[PDB]
């Protein structure tokens, strides 16, 4: 789905598989977080489903030893003196030692501040222990976490529950038309983007000799040339758009290891899983009710939350017993209006537009020479048209699918292209879609605060700031203290400070609150990027302080206060909202749960071979399932006819479904349901088990079931 999604996939740790354990065999002990997981396996990264506790990610600093265990780096302490000498420890090795917490204050030389320090101990025990008894210390505060876990700013403010979803959802992000880097960062964004392998790094140092959208060339110091080729509009394994584009201009001096051209969800070699949006924390006219999300129409007009999606449709020509399927432009009983977008071979022309139901690859197969209808024979002598022997079997656009045809890849057995036995021509048509965000799309923050798009009001409707700036998104206040994820609040506070820029007051000295603030941050530009590492980074004090440091607009006026709030004008009524509204900037990802995909319905359609019941899945145009629990709801209600209708004519009444259809198009009454074929199957299944099952009428005689018994 995105670079991160792939990266975390490679570092997955599953207990499942051959030699491992089944899902039903797993108790409650195998799944929950064990003490030894610290620095080895992340306690936050794991699926929500019935897979929970059986799948996890590997911690950042961890590695595997040649024996199959998981090591983690610890800093070495001689005698109360932290060294730079590092040794990797296995689990049971750590047990026979004593490890100090990472954030325990350290003398500039390397000595501990307090004799008694926070100490980790065997069996998950923790106690204060004299500095002389300190063997090792942790490498980083952010040690225990996975890759995906680290990219969550102010993790220590969000409960493990919403922090969990926040991690899982990041893998579910979707590449946009162009990617913006998150204003608020954690530092992990960089290394992730590089290691993902879906961006392009420079092997050896040199200088850009020639750049194109197609490829980048680099002349090396030794005189050799290497050219990296861009992946342009390649379909992903999940239908997203892996597209790479050059960073550097021609003649730029670049050094080895530098990102010369990033790809999907990447800006300047950094993880860009979404956009920086203008947030507002307030309930608004009920359209954000129960975690629902409101959007500025600006995000549609400016393609801010728009993505690209490619589908691969495939069809082939085989050898039958009636001849062989040929792909041609001549399809039986089709006007030259429907064939308009096709070439001479029968394939869609590149760049053509396709809607659902239209033709992609004109294929026809010879039909079985069975005697055609004496009611269709008569119909062919009047109009004097002779029936062909080739039935249409062309590849038509599946429901919902649309967009532009961006590529045709043809393989002919004629052109010696090696096919599997029995195939002649094999066509692949690639269709791209440019999906602007819409209602029912799943937007998510990094704090496990999901939500679907409730309403997209026109830009003017938006509760806007005093200078006439319409907000981008209206989150709901209610679903914030409930979730225990107020890190999203802090992302907004720090976010707003990142957009305006700031400046601490140095007159009468550097203040006490910003005494722990590194020099580089006492001054910040408009649209400036920052890092808030996990279990480090911004503190609530510095944050509240920086809120007062907020620099005014182009109109010399401050917009928000020290609380973090501001005053809004109701875009509909014009009257200013009675109470101060918390406003700022938050990073928002567009997940891969889009209404375009998920929406589905069915009138009639295909049917099961055995049960003669409707098939399932959107792929097969199957209908929904009215299961056992759903039936109880009917039975409880008292709608016998509704329920009966659902499990007969709506389902597996072979003669029923056909007849109900006609009755509707004729505008007549819906008839009486018959015998479900599912039942007939059962009775013939039972009889195959030496179970002489007979259906008796009121008399006592065994009746037929559209079938007779003969020896």
């Amino acid at each position: 789905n995105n670079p991160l999604s792939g990266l975390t996939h490679k570092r997955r740790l599953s207990a499942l598989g051959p030699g491992g354990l089944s899902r039903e065999r797993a108790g409650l002990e195998v799944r929950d977080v064990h003490p030894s997981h610290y620095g080895r396996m992340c306690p936050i990264e794991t699926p929500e489903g019935p897979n929970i506790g059986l799948i996890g990610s590997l911690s950042v600093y961890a590695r595997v030893n040649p024996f199959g265990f998981i090591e983690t780096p610890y800093r070495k302490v001689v005698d109360g003196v932290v060294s730079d000498e590092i040794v990797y420890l296995t689990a049971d090795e750590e047990d026979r030692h004593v490890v100090a917490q990472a954030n325990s204050p350290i003398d500039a030389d390397g000595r501990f501040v307090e004799p008694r320090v926070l100490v980790r101990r065997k069996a998950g025990e923790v106690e204060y222990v004299p500095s002389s008894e300190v063997d090792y210390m942790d490498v980083s505060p952010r040690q225990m976490v996975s890759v995906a876990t680290a990219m969550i700013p102010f993790l220590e403010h969000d409960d493990a529950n919403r922090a969990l979803m926040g991690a899982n959802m990041q893998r579910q992000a979707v590449p946009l038309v162009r990617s913006e880097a998150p204003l608020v960062g954690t530092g992990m964004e960089l290394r992730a983007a590089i290691d993902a392998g879906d961006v392009v790094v420079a092997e050896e140092s040199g200088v850009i000799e020639e750049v194109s959208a197609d490829y980048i060339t680099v002349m090396h110091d030794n005189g050799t040339r290497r050219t990296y080729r861009m992946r342009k509009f390649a379909r992903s394994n999940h239908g997203t758009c892996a597209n790479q584009c050059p960073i550097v201009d021609a003649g730029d001096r670049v050094e080895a290891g530098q990102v010369i051209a990033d790809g999907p969800c990447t800006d300047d070699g950094e993880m860009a899983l979404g956009k920086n949006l203008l947030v507002a924390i307030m309930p608004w006219e009920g359209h954000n009710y129960e975690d629902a999300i409101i959007l500025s129409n600006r995000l549609v007009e400016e393609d801010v939350l728009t993505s690209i999606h490619i589908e691969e449709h495939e069809i082939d020509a085989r050898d039958t017993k009636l001849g062989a399927e040929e792909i041609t432009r001549d399809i039986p009983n089709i006007s030259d209006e429907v064939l308009a977008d096709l070439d001479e071979r029968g394939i869609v022309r590149i760049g053509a537009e396709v809607r659902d139901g239209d033709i992609l690859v004109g294929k026809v197969t010879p039909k079985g020479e069975t005697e055609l209808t004496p009611e269709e024979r008569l119909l062919r002598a009047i109009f004097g048209e002779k029936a062909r022997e080739v039935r249409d079997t062309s590849l038509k656009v599946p429901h919902g699918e649309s967009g532009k045809v961006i590529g045709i890849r043809v393989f002919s057995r004629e052109d010696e292209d090696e096919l599997p036995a029995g195939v002649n021509e094999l066509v692949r048509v690639y269709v791209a879609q440019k999906r602007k965000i819409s209602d029912g799309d799943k937007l998510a923050g990094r704090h496990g605060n999901k939500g679907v798009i409730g309403k997209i009001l026109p830009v003017e409707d938006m509760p806007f700031l005093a200078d006439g700036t319409p907000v981008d998104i209206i989150l709901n206040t209610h679903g914030v203290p409930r979730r225990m994820n107020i890190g999203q609040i802090l992302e907004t506070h720090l976010g707003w400070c990142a957009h305006s820029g700031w400046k601490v007051d140095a007159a009468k000295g550097v203040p006490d609150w910003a005494a722990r603030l590194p020099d580089e941050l006492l001054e910040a530009q408009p649209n400036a990027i920052v890092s808030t590492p996990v279990f480090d980074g911004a503190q609530e004090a510095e944050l509240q302080g920086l809120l007062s440091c907020t620099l005014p607009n182009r109109d010399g006026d401050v917009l928000v206060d020290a609380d973090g709030k501001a005053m809004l004008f109701d875009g509909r009524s014009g009257e200013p909202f009675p109470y101060p509204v918390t406003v700022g900037y938050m990073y928002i990802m567009k997940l891969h749960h889009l209404v375009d995909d998920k929406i589905h319905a069915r009138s009639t359609g295909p049917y099961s071979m055995i049960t003669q019941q409707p098939l399932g899945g959107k792929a097969q145009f199957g209908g929904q399932r009215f299961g056992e629990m759903e039936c109880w709801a009917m039975q409880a209600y008292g709608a016998a006819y509704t329920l009966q209708e659902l499990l007969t004519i709506k389902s597996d009444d072979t003669v029923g479904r056909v007849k109900v259809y006609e009755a509707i198009v004729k505008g007549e009454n819906i008839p009486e349901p018959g015998i479900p074929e599912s039942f007939k199957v059962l009775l013939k299944e039972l009889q195959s088990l030496c179970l002489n099952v007979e259906v008796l009428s009121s008399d006592g005689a065994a009746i037929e079931l559209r079938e007779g018994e003969d020896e």
Binding site: L190, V254, E270, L517, E520, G537
Partner: peptide
């Protein structure tokens, strides 16, 4: 600066100095 190693845009960092070992 945070990761002053590859050639990345400067992302300033609220932090205690982290120099044990790079990711």
């Amino acid at each position: 600066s945070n990761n002053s190693v590859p050639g990345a845009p400067n992302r300033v960092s609220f932090a205690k100095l982290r120099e044990p070992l790079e990711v």
